[model samples]
Target: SLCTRDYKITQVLFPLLYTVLFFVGLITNGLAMRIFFQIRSKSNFIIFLKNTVISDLLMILTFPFKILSDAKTGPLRTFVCQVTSVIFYFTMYISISFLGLITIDRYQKTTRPKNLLGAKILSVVIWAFMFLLSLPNMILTNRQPRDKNVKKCSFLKSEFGLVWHEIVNYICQVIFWINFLIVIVCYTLITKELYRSYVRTADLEDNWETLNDNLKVIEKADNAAQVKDALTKMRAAALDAQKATPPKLEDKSPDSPEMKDFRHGFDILVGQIDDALKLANEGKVKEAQAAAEQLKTTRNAYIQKYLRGVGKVPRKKVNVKVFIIIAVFFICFVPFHFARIPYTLSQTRDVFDCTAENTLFYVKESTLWLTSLNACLNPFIYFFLCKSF
Candidate 1:
């Protein structure tokens, strides 16, 4: 009786979660692509963003079919369910992989500018490889069963079916975690660099401001000419104007009010440095390297000023806060998926014996809800994390 009750409860839960995930994932993934196209030309990360959203879209579209298969019984029913399961698994893996790619891209943009292009290309390969690998599963797993009496569709009862399914699931999980590790490492490095850059830039600006304030207190007659000269040099250094020669490091001037007016000149130099650095870190490594080399030569003269003001622009989209919010939302909803996975498995086996049905039902219910939760959560993550999208 307990086992039967559990099965009944699972049937209700599976379709409920599946329906919500399909609608939410579809809407969110569509929004992600919409935003991606809006800003595609401006950001290189657009490709990864697009792929991730597409994966989520695919997963959601087929999920409800699996739900209906569970609620009904027929000869074609089992086969249909099996096919849908394979597709759902394949697309889910793709979504997870693309997320790792996004994290890696963020890391590269923050810590190492030279590898950003390679990251983008690699993300493309992940999508292609996933597509090819999925073909065999779709082909082998879908067919009319010889026995029309089979009441449920799944691999749990087949001699080698469960083995193959497990193999694929394990492999996908392993790959997912490996990429996850790489992303974690990359993010760690990026965070460190960002902190360093922020601190250095702030300090340099503060020191320059202090000097400017001191000079204003002691305004001198000839100081005006001196200030104008300092201002010109500062502007040239900040702008990296092609017409202006690089300033000498040793020629420190204190007389000019313009030179002492640290905010304007300091901000300009910082902005120029930030732009040059980001450009170098992007796809054109050779060009970026050249720009860096040139900036390096000029930066020596006003190290503190440049460091304080460089690279403070917000990278993520304005509406991306919804991503983190939705991720939390999914986390709250994950238990339902786990409950569904084992219920589906047990139903296929007709293992209605007390111990067998209860155990499998609980496991199935847990994994099913967890899986469904992913479809919706993924698009939200993409919205916030994908700078290009």
Candidate 2:
């Protein structure tokens, strides 16, 4: 028994997906290629990424054949089966390999494999190996397709072709998810290093705002006790501001004239606030109220001078960019690979019942269509990589 179910979703879905990727692919890779070639090489990153642009462009060439074949049923041409399908999967394989190498380059200490020959030859070998493997698959899959409607690619495969195909897919699948795992690990650490640098620096922004708010509350207080409470609150904030100052030698910016005056100004402000509160405690309430109102101007002055614009420092997109790659892997590839494994087993070794096999066949098609969405998402990654310099 075989799956004879009409797959309307795959029939409709794949063509639209192919269209989006095809246009975006051309626009981005075409532009990226022009820019990459116009500039000379920067490092292993740029060198390999130049090839990354080329690989995706090559994969884009397959979209027309795939869209047509998927929109209807059969390839309608033998070369479409033997050649186009070969290039598509092979392109996917190389893209996966490239993603891994790019990540490894990113994760390294920046000099271990810096030479052009190292990254360049390694890229050539990956291209060479996957292409060599796929040529035989195209040649071996010489049987007449069993039907025009179902399992067209498989029918085109001889037994040896089918066996080799399964083996190759497992190999591809192993690396597919393996690369994602490594990316998560590598990018997570890359972003973690970011956290260690930028994380502690931003706290002063909050600490400065906190002192201003505490001082503001005291002027509008309902009672003397409330005023006294905020004086303590204000004191704590000043202490936070004082202790949070940077090391003396890290940069002379912290020890510059403005920073020295800022530090001395903070000390004077704290002592003056303590004096104002003591006046209130001594029930020189009339004078203290006027002084409290005056303190408002002084607090605002320090806020404006000392810490108004701490800055928008550090790379803003580290976590966002990091998780997005992992996110893409989960969204498009995860389900497809899951559905793919079981579907291939039935495909290579006959069916479950007609019901399960029929359902399984469509599930694989559905997820497979979803997996192609990764290509559309990838242009931004290269955009992201290139712009940081």
Best candidate, lDDT-wise?
2
Tell me the tens digit of each residue's lDDT in model 2 across 98-164.
7777777766742124587798898889889898888888889687665556545666778898998
- Evaluate residue 261 in candidate 2 and report its C-alpha lDDT on the 0 to 100 scale: 62
User: All models: lDDT?
Assistant: 0.53, 0.69
Q: Model 1, which residues run further than 4 Å from truth?
A: 1-5, 37-43, 112-124, 142-160, 194-357, 381-389
Q: Using Cα atoms with residue i matched to residue i, what is each candidate's TM-score against the true structure?
A: 0.56, 0.72
- Candidate 1 lDDT (Cα, 0 to 1): 0.53
Q: Candidate 1: deviation at residue 118, Å?
A: 5.2
Error of 1 at 328 (Å): 7.8
* Tens-digit lDDT track of model 1 for 71-138: 54464466555566667767766766766666655544443244456656776787777767666555
